[PDB]
Amino acid sequence: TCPFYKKIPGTGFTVDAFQYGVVEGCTAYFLTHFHSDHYAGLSKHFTFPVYCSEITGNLLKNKLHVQEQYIHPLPLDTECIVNGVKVVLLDANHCPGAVMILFYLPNGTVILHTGDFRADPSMERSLLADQKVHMLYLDTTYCSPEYTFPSQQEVIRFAINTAFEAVTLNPHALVVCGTYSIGKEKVFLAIADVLGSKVGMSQEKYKTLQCLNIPEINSLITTDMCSSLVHLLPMMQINFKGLQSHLKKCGGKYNQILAFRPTGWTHSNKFTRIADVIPQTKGNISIYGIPYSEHSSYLEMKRFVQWLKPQKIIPTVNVGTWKSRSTMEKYFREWKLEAGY
């Protein structure tokens, strides 16, 4: 059945709740972003109103075939009325089209649902600054102090410099990047830009990227693999076997692969700086795991919450075990006593 942390009290609304069949009492289903654990259940047979960003609505229409009449895209940073309730969509700094949702309840309660987000000090100057938030439905993915990671800018600098050096030493090296969802497009687009190439990819993945309103995209991507020296593959093919296989398919155009796996977190982060990252190598194949995150680090999360000062926090991630739930609740109380709210 639908869990309580997916329901917005005082409304007929749910968030990211498409796999429970008809939710009793639901008048509008919000979708924060186009990731499968959140859209799970949508298809061309869905006949209830879906509220989302423009980009998420492009993916619903083109990838899932949801009928246009049930897609309700809203502009960001704009007061909108949905079934008599004021809402605002805010950029969540997650994947393309991902939003946070502000609900202004008829009784005067204000609720922020972060969806999935990577907290940023820029958020402290959005429409959030303008009123008090009483309840926070929080993306707690990395809510423990072991989770540190570098800025996205530092990670992309490392990837650009590594790729440019390799290909300049060996003009017959191929760069491969893994993907299994939207998000993290900066990794492959930045590397292709420094090398003067388009990114080559499957017809399915090209279609997906063409829904994202990315500026000048026709100039950066292609389905012609032969004309590209940065290839995108399924994350599952980023291993020695899969890459050896791919290299055979390129017909002797290349004699070396340098591959990137943008993971979330990996426990090399507790010890190792970005400067000191090294690949796994076999033969003429090297694989780099780079800590490019689209979720908050522990410190980023803590800063956002201590700035916002909510009266009540409802975690949305890691809620399945008592030990996780109790650990998170202890951090929330620490943050509140340190900051004085």
Footprint of Ni ion on this chain (CB under 5 A)?
35, 116
Residues paired with residue 233 on neighbouring β-strands, in sequence order: 178
Cβ 304 to Ni ion shortest distance, Å? 17
Cβ 38 to Ni ion shortest distance, Å? 6
Distance (Å, whole) CA 78 – CA 180: 32
Q: How many residues does the chain have?
A: 341
Please say which residue, 57 or 97, places its beta carbon nearer to Ni ion. Answer: 97
Cβ 15 to Ni ion shortest distance, Å? 13
CA 134 remoteness from chain centre: 26
Please say which residue, 183 or 289, places its beta carbon nearer to Ni ion. Answer: 183
- DSSP category for residue 329: H
Cβ 184 to Ni ion shortest distance, Å? 11
Cβ 23 to Ni ion shortest distance, Å? 21
Cβ 36 to Ni ion shortest distance, Å? 9
C-alpha distances in Å from residue 94, one per residue of 34, 58, 116, 120, 233: 11, 17, 6, 11, 21
Q: Which residues contact 128 (CB under 8 A, 6 or more apart)?
A: 90, 102, 112, 308
Distance (Å, whole) CA 110 – CA 275: 43
3-state secondary structure of 317: coil
Cβ 40 to Ni ion shortest distance, Å? 12
Distance (Å, whole) CA 166 – CA 8: 51
Note whether 149 and 293 are within 8 A (CB): yes
Kind plus residue range of the DSSP H or E element containing 298? helix 298-308
Please say which residue, 15 or 230, places its beta carbon nearer to Ni ion. Answer: 15
Please say which residue, 98 or 259, places its beta carbon nearer to Ni ion. Answer: 98
SS3 content of the chain, % helix, strand, coil (to 5): 35, 20, 45
Please say which residue, 35 or 231, places its beta carbon nearer to Ni ion. Answer: 35
Distance (Å, whole) CA 293 – CA 267: 14
Please say which residue, 116 or 300, places its beta carbon nearer to Ni ion. Answer: 116
Please say which residue, 152 or 286, places its beta carbon nearer to Ni ion. Answer: 152
Provide the terminal-to-terminal Cα distance of the chain, rounded to the nearest Å. Answer: 35
Cβ 325 to Ni ion shortest distance, Å? 21
Please say which residue, 33 or 231, places its beta carbon nearer to Ni ion. Answer: 33
3-state secondary structure of 110: strand
